Design a binder for these strands. Structure first.
Ligand SMILES: [Mn+2]
Ligand SMILES: [Mn+2]
Ligand code: NA
Ligand code: NA
Ligand code: NA
Length: 316
DNA sequence: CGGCAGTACTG
DNA sequence: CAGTACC
DNA sequence: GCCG
C-alpha cells in the first residue's frame, strides 16, 4: 500500500459516515480506500487522483489537502458522538438506528447499555460475547468447527456434503466466523434436517446460543471443548443441490467481490444471487427471468464470460 | 437525477 | 413494516 | 461519496 498516509485518514471519515447512517457515502469512501491500496504508486497529483476508478472530485481535493497539509481539515469537525456510535453498533443485532437512539437517550458506554437499555434477544447474546465476536480465530480452529458439523450431519445421512465457505475457503489465516454450507446429491434428502442436526450439535454443548433459526439459514454461537476456547460465530446454510454452486460462491465472498459480480451481471441483463444466476433482464426503471443451470462454480463465471477465479483470489 | 442487490429472519 | 444481517 |  503506497498510500497508507492517505488511507489512514480517510478510514476515519468512512467509519464516521457508516456509524452515522450515511451508508452510500460510507460505501463511496470504502471503494476509494481499497482502490488506493490496490494502486501501485503513491498518489502525486490532483489529476492522478481523478485517474483512479472510485476517486472523484471531492475526494481528489481531500487527498490534495492531505498531500500538502500532511493532515486533513474535516477530521477536526467530526461529531464527538462517533466513537460511542461505533461502540454500540459493534453489538451484534444493533445497527445505526439503535446506536443513535441510545445516544440520544444519553447512553455513552457499554456499562450504560448493560445497566439501563432494553435489548432484543439477539443483542443480549451479542453484548455478552462483545469481545469474542471482535477477534478472529485461527483457520485451524475453523477446521475443527466444520468437521464437528460434518460428522454430526453425516451421522443422519452420510450422503450429505458439508463445506466451510467465507474467508476460510478464501484461504485466509484467520476467520471472523465459520460459514458451513450443506446439501445432498439426491436432490431431496437435504430437507427437514435442521431439526435433528442442531439438536445433535446442541447435545454435548457445541452450540451455545442461537441468533437466527430460519428454515434454511441458522446463525448462532459455538465453542469447542477444553480450556482456552473462545465463543465463535457459526452460520449454517442448507440448500437444494440445484443451488449448491451459487450458494458456494455467494457465501465464500468476499462481499466486495460479490458486489462487483452483481454489477457485471447487470451489464449483461442477468442477475446473480445466492440461489441462482438468472437471465432476469428487464431494466428500465430499476418480472423475473430464467434460472440458468450452474452445476459448478465454474459455470457461473463462464455464463458471465469470466475466467474462473479460485476462492483464494476473490478476497477483495 | 438516481442506483450502488437481494434475501431472510425478528418483533 | 423498520431494522439488521449474510457475502 | 462515485459514476452513468
Ligand atoms: Mn463468514
Ligand atoms: Mn467466551
Ligand atoms: Na475517477
Ligand atoms: Na452490530
Ligand atoms: Na457468517
Amino acid at each position: 500500500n503506497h498510500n497508507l498516509h492517505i488511507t489512514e485518514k480517510l478510514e476515519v471519515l468512512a467509519k464516521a459516515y457508516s456509524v452515522q447512517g450515511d451508508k452510500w457515502r460510507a460505501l463511496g469512501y470504502a471503494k476509494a480506500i481499497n482502490a488506493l491500496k490496490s494502486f501501485h504508486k503513491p498518489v502525486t497529483s490532483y489529476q492522478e487522483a481523478c485517474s483512479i476508478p472510485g476517486i472523484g472530485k471531492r475526494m481528489a481535493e481531500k487527498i490534495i489537502e492531505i498531500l500538502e497539509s500532511g493532515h486533513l481539515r474535516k477530521l477536526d469537525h467530526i461529531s464527538e458522538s462517533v466513537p460511542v456510535l461505533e461502540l454500540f453498533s459493534n453489538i451484534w443485532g444493533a445497527g445505526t438506528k439503535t446506536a443513535q437512539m441510545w445516544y440520544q437517550q444519553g447512553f455513552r458506554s457499554l456499562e450504560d447499555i448493560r445497566s439501563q437499555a432494553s435489548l432484543t434477544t439477539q443483542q443480549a447474546i451479542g453484548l455478552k460475547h462483545y469481545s469474542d465476536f471482535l477477534e478472529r480465530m485461527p483457520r485451524e480452529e475453523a477446521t475443527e468447527i466444520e468437521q464437528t458439523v460434518q460428522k454430526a450431519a453425516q451421522a443422519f445421512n452420510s450422503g450429505l456434503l458439508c463445506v466451510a465457505c467465507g474467508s476460510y475457503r478464501r484461504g485466509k489465516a484467520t476467520c471472523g466466523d465459520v460459514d458451513v454450507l450443506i446439501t445432498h446429491p439426491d436432490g431431496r434428502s437435504h430437507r427437514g434436517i435442521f431439526s435433528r442436526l442442531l439438536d445433535s450439535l446442541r447435545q454435548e454443548g457445541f452450540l451455545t446460543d442461537d441468533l437466527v433459526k430460519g428454515e434454511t439459514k441458522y446463525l448462532g454461537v459455538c465453542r469447542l471443548p477444553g480450556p482456552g476456547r473462545r465463543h465463535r460465530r457459526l452460520d449454517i446454510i442448507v440448500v437444494p443441490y440445484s443451488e449448491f454452486a451459487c450458494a458456494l460462491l455467494y457465501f465464500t465472498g468476499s462481499a466486495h467481490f460479490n458486489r462487483s459480480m452483481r454489477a457485471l451481471a447487470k451489464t449483461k441483463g442477468m442477475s446473480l444471487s445466492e440461489h441462482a444466476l438468472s437471465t432476469a433482464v428487464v431494466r428500465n426503471t430499476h418480472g423475473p427471468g430464467r434460472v440458468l443451470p450452474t452445476p459448478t462454480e465454474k459455470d457461473v463465471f463462464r455464463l458471465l464470460g469470466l475466467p474462473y477465479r479460485e476462492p483464494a483470489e476473490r478476497d477483495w
